[PDB]
Design a protein around this motif. Structure first.
Motif, short mmCIF file in Angstrom:
data_model
loop_
_atom_site.label_atom_id
_atom_site.label_comp_id
_atom_site.label_asym_id
_atom_site.label_seq_id
_atom_site.Cartn_x
_atom_site.Cartn_y
_atom_site.Cartn_z
N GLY A 82 30.54 40.27 37.16
CA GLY A 82 31.65 40.80 37.92
C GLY A 82 31.22 41.36 39.26
N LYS A 83 32.19 41.51 40.15
CA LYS A 83 31.95 42.01 41.50
C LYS A 83 31.80 43.53 41.44
N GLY A 84 30.59 44.01 41.70
CA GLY A 84 30.29 45.43 41.67
C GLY A 84 29.21 45.75 40.66
N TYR A 85 28.99 47.05 40.47
CA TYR A 85 28.00 47.51 39.50
C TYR A 85 28.47 47.19 38.09
N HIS A 99 34.41 41.53 32.23
CA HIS A 99 33.36 42.32 32.86
C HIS A 99 33.92 43.60 33.47
N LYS A 131 21.07 43.93 35.97
CA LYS A 131 20.94 44.45 37.32
C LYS A 131 21.10 43.37 38.38
N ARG A 132 21.54 42.18 37.99
CA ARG A 132 21.76 41.09 38.94
C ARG A 132 23.06 41.35 39.69
N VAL A 133 22.96 41.47 41.02
CA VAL A 133 24.12 41.78 41.84
C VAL A 133 25.08 40.60 41.82
N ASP A 134 26.37 40.89 41.62
CA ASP A 134 27.43 39.88 41.62
C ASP A 134 27.20 38.81 40.55
N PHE A 135 26.80 39.25 39.36
CA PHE A 135 26.64 38.37 38.21
C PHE A 135 27.64 38.66 37.10
N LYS A 165 25.31 33.97 30.94
CA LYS A 165 26.11 35.12 31.36
C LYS A 165 26.48 36.00 30.17
N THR A 184 33.49 46.50 35.87
CA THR A 184 32.74 46.71 37.10
C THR A 184 32.89 48.15 37.57
N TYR A 185 31.82 48.69 38.13
CA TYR A 185 31.81 50.04 38.67
C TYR A 185 31.78 49.96 40.19
#
Ligand SMILES: *[C@@H]1O[C@H](CO)[C@@H](O)[C@H](O)[C@H]1NC(C)=O
Ligand SMILES: *[C@@H]1O[C@H](CO)[C@@H](O)[C@H](O)[C@H]1NC(C)=O
Ligand SMILES: *[C@@H]1O[C@H](CO)[C@@H](O)[C@H](O)[C@H]1NC(C)=O
Ligand SMILES: *[C@@H]1O[C@H](CO)[C@@H](O)[C@H](O)[C@H]1NC(C)=O
Ligand SMILES: *[C@@H]1O[C@H](CO)[C@@H](O)[C@H](O)[C@H]1NC(C)=O
Ligand SMILES: *[C@@H]1O[C@H](CO)[C@@H](O)[C@H](O)[C@H]1NC(C)=O
Ligand SMILES: *[C@@H]1O[C@H](CO)[C@@H](O)[C@H](O)[C@H]1NC(C)=O
Ligand SMILES: *[C@@H]1O[C@H](CO)[C@@H](O)[C@H](O)[C@H]1NC(C)=O
Ligand SMILES: *[C@@H]1O[C@H](CO)[C@@H](O)[C@H](O)[C@H]1NC(C)=O
Ligand SMILES: *[C@@H]1O[C@H](CO)[C@@H](O)[C@H](O)[C@H]1NC(C)=O
Ligand SMILES: *[C@@H]1O[C@H](CO)[C@@H](O)[C@H](O)[C@H]1NC(C)=O
Ligand SMILES: *[C@@H]1O[C@H](CO)[C@@H](O)[C@H](O)[C@H]1NC(C)=O
Ligand SMILES: *[C@@H]1O[C@H](CO)[C@@H](O)[C@H](O)[C@H]1NC(C)=O
Lengths: 420, 88, 49, 50, 198, 49
Positions: free
Chosen positions: E102-105, E122, E96-100, E86, E124-125
């Motif tokens: 932090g939650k979000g972009y 993290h 670009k891993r979704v939900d890796f 991580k 997050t966007y």
């Protein structure tokens, strides 16, 4: 005989030969992943000796091993609950599909739930549930999330994947037509979204055929759900071996406490009691160690499944051979008894064709390199197509950038470039 | 309930975000005189996206959020002396 | 709870303390009928000795 | 065959040559009453961690 | 209650050490728990008998403790490998891993030291304050379809525009933001609209 | 190579039976691990001359 490692293919490699596919097919594959095991909690005091106060006194005299075993079992149960919660409950807002089903032209009536069922599941979920098939102190604690709650979790995940797509796991829900979502998922693997809007009916028919084939395979083949059945059988065998260990004297006169207490004098009776107690304690220790190892393996598998869900269901991941063999487009999670089933939708091209390739071309002395294409040719004329789908286009300056002259690149060929 | 029966808490017909996991979906919480209630846990809200193949939701604003998460890396490395531990 | 937790301050959540078990009340002695009775009557209360 | 548990009637039948029955495990499932020749089932009474 | 995992690990280690020291002071079926009173108040045979009994008990306790420590060390090694990958995929680069991360972009991450652990930050966007518009797959003006190159064909009811897929930015539909491929007779959902030529 | 020891060991239950089951499981695990690590492709290719 000697095992064969497969076929014997010989790719005709050449410096001026490329194979660009002209067709594709959508193949939906399954991937069984265990999430949690059965919650077991054996009572140390009741399993070591039943209906005997001398046994309890001697056992509390040996130390606090029973407390350690109870704490380990409680920790295992809490870990299984946490795994079950973190695998399925990824979204904090349950979504529902609209009454009208016009998802581009696809048939999603095989994975969405129907109101004509007391458990609120689907046909594939019902097939998966039907496929997989107290005594002296051991008990089976029920899981926190019931089957209906897991079914509703999967339903919300499917609704978010269909309607919103991937934005439901990265913020608020953003509605988007299924055709546009499929086009944007296609535009993330290399192929241009223009091939989906021109072959939507074929893609929908292939998806329906793949769903039907998956249903037929799940209904016919009984050895599909192998991992969950193996885990259940291993747990049952471990419980049976733990229960059957009480029918052993461990080098004593008998295996019944009351018989030894009523037949032998107090000193020899307590000697045989100590022997039986230490034997059963060693048995329970080995059982707890094996259960802890299996719980660690199940936790690793559940973390892998949760990562796969968060990366393929709540979004699109370009990891090769991570979600189905081929270009991963989307996936659909499905409930299963003590497990999860992913319906990986992949993009597998087929029906390739040989073509003559070239690195670049220089029209008026200056080399022209393709932006996101390949300079294929059918012998006479030269065209630029995509990297995963054949689409002959005129070589123009709007899709090829010029940089330097054709004096150092190896493999240059003379060709004209059309100027709009 | 499914795991037995709860003695000492009333069963209400509500559904909130539960904090104390009891078992088989049952959850207890001290909520209003106030006492321990026994209600079936909820799975969140009941949002229903009005899907239609004629509209899209494009966001206009964004909020930068900083999320934290802890992860253990090491433990307290120890070493016991067997001869002295077993026999002092 | 405070006893099994070894702390006077207990937070929220579930906590197992002991093992409840119903204890028996009486015993039941089950044995077959008395049919093969030893002919002791003809031994002590005999007609000739 | 000593032990403890709830003694209730069952639905299984015993041929007139057998004795107390067992189960998949090594525990006594059912017993044959040597007094009235009735089929009785052994079920341990309810127990659980509080 | 945020620092839970590290606190739980510390509490588990402390409880293991405490229960080990407690089991050392157990009887294990002997008459006492001290070796001196056994070797000084017993005949040599019974003395060595009780000594070997206590030795077996302490050895079993130590083996159980070592097995528990090995299982916990394997779990901590798995968690440390996860934390390391991580770190490598979030701090040393955008993932670009979704939900890796932090939650979000995912935008960026800031590691922080911690006792027997690592704490991440993290960034997050997450989008908010969204509004629905009228969309369409493509448009065709000169009898030929115009699919968007990188954007979404939106419209506020009357005029059509192209905007980003994650932020509303209406722009004039020009030939530089769309490409032509085929006619507008095969795609379903085609709408009639004119395109501005630069 | 002893029968009395075999009987005395069987009197201790079925421990080494579970041990042999675990060893067979470990062997099958190693086999499937090697298979999933190396044998990933379903068609052996050949390098051009
Ligand atoms: C691609 O293959 C499918 C069979 O899976 C076929 O139905 C379809 O017509 C093919 N498409 C083209 C363009 O040949
Ligand atoms: C979808 O599939 C179901 C069963 O798989 C079938 O009954 C139905 O006719 C199909 N089409 C639609 C539009 O539901
Ligand atoms: C391409 O050429 C190879 C060898 O020259 C041949 O085996 C193959 O059938 C040809 N066509 C395709 C589609 O690969
Ligand atoms: C190559 O493709 C062009 C473009 O359609 C066509 O005009 C030409 O006849 C083709 N040549 C051969 C040999 O197939
Ligand atoms: C490809 O290799 C052959 C050797 O067989 C050579 O004659 C030819 O010039 C090469 N072409 C290019 C473009 O490098
Ligand atoms: C390509 O054109 C250049 C000048 O236009 C010439 O010098 C060169 O020989 C040509 N190469 C081929 C292969 O025709
Ligand atoms: C959605 O697709 C269906 C397909 O027949 C079409 O009839 C309808 O006009 C489209 N739009 C809406 C808003 O339903
Ligand atoms: C976006 O939301 C923030 C509040 O978090 C606000 O300060 C800002 O003005 C908003 N931007 C727009 C364009 O509305
Ligand atoms: C024992 O005697 C009772 C009393 O009459 C009778 O009901 C029962 O059948 C007898 N059992 C046997 C085995 O003789
Ligand atoms: C002999 O007869 C007497 C008088 O009735 C009686 O008390 C006794 O029990 C009889 N003996 C036996 C062995 O039954
Ligand atoms: C957005 O949704 C509302 C909800 O009914 C609807 O009235 C409206 O037409 C939709 N489109 C726009 C552009 O507001
Ligand atoms: C929609 O956008 C156009 C673009 O200029 C603008 O003129 C108009 O006022 C907006 N609103 C409506 C209701 O058309
Ligand atoms: C769009 O233009 C075409 C070309 O004349 C016409 O046939 C059609 O009715 C128009 N409207 C649509 C496609 O909604």
């Amino acid at each position: 005989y000697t095992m064969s490692l497969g076929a014997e293919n010989s790719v005709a490699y050449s410096n001026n030969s490329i194979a660009i596919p002209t067709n594709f097919t959508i193949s939906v594959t399954t991937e069984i992943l265990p999430v949690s095991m059965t919650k077991t909690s054996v009572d140390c005091t009741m399993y070591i000796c039943g209906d005997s106060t001398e046994c309890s006194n001697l056992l509390l005299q040996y130390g606090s091993f029973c407390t350690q075993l109870n704490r380990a079992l409680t920790g295992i149960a809490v870990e299984q609950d946490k795994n079950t919660q973190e695998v399925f409950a990824q979204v904090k807002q349950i979504y529902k599909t609209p009454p009208i089903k016009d998802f581009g032209g696809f048939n999603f009536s095989q994975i969405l739930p129907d109101p004509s069922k007391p458990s609120k599941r689907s046909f594939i979920e019902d097939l998966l549930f039907n496929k997989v098939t107290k005594f002296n102190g051991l008990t089976v604690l029920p899981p926190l999330l019931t089957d209906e709650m897991i079914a509703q979790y999967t339903s919300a995940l499917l609704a978010g994947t269909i309607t919103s797509g991937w934005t439901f796991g990265a913020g608020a829900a953003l509605q988007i037509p299924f055709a546009m979502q499929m086009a944007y998922r296609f535009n993330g693997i290399g192929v241009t979204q223009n091939v989906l809007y021109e072959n939507q009916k074929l893609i929908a028919n292939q998806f329906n055929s793949a769903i039907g084939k998956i249903q037929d395979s799940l209904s016919s083949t009984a050895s599909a759900l192998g991992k969950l059945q193996d885990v259940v059988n291993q747990n049952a065998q471990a419980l049976n071996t733990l229960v059957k260990q009480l029918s052993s004297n461990f080098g004593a006169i008998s295996s019944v406490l009351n018989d030894i207490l009523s037949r032998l004098d107090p000193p020899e009776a307590e000697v045989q009691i100590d022997r039986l107690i230490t034997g059963r304690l060693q048995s329970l220790q080995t059982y707890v160690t094996q259960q802890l190892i299996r719980a660690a393996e199940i936790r690793a598998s559940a973390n892998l499944a949760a990562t796969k869900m968060s990366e393929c269901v709540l979004g699109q991941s370009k990891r090769v051979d991570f979600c189905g063999k081929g270009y991963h487009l989307m996936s659909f999670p499905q409930s299963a008894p003590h497990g999860v089933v992913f319906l990986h939708v992949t993009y597998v091209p087929a029906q390739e064709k040989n073509f003559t390739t070239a690195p670049a071309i220089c029209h008026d002395g200056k080399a022209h390199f393709p932006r996101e294409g390949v300079f294929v040719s059918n012998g006479t004329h030269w065209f630029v197509t995509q990297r995963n789908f054949y689409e002959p286009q005129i070589i123009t300056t709007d899709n090829t950038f010029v940089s330097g002259n054709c004096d150092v690149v190896i493999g240059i060929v003379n060709n004209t470039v059309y100027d709009p | 309930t499914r795991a037995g029966c709860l003695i000492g808490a009333e069963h209400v017909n509500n559904s909130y975000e539960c904090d104390i996991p009891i078992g088989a979906g049952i959850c207890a919480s001290y909520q209003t005189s106030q006492s321990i209630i026994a209600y079936t846990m909820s799975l969140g809200a009941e949002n229903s996206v009005a899907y239609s193949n004629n509209s899209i939701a494009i966001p206009t604003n964004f909020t930068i959020s900083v999320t934290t998460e802890i992860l253990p890396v090491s433990m307290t490395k120890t070493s016991v002396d067997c001869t002295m531990y077993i026999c002092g | 709870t405070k006893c099994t937790l070894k702390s006077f301050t207990v937070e929220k959540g579930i906590y197992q303390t002991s093992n409840f078990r119903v204890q028996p009340t009486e015993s039941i002695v089950r044995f077959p009928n008395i049919t093969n009775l030893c002919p002791f009557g003809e031994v002590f209360n005999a007609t000739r000795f | 065959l000593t032990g403890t548990g709830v003694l209730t009637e069952s639905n299984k039948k015993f041929l007139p040559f057998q004795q107390f029955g067992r189960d998949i495990a090594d525990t006594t499932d059912a017993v044959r009453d040597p007094q009235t020749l009735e089929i009785l089932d052994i079920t341990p009474c309810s127990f659980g961690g509080v």
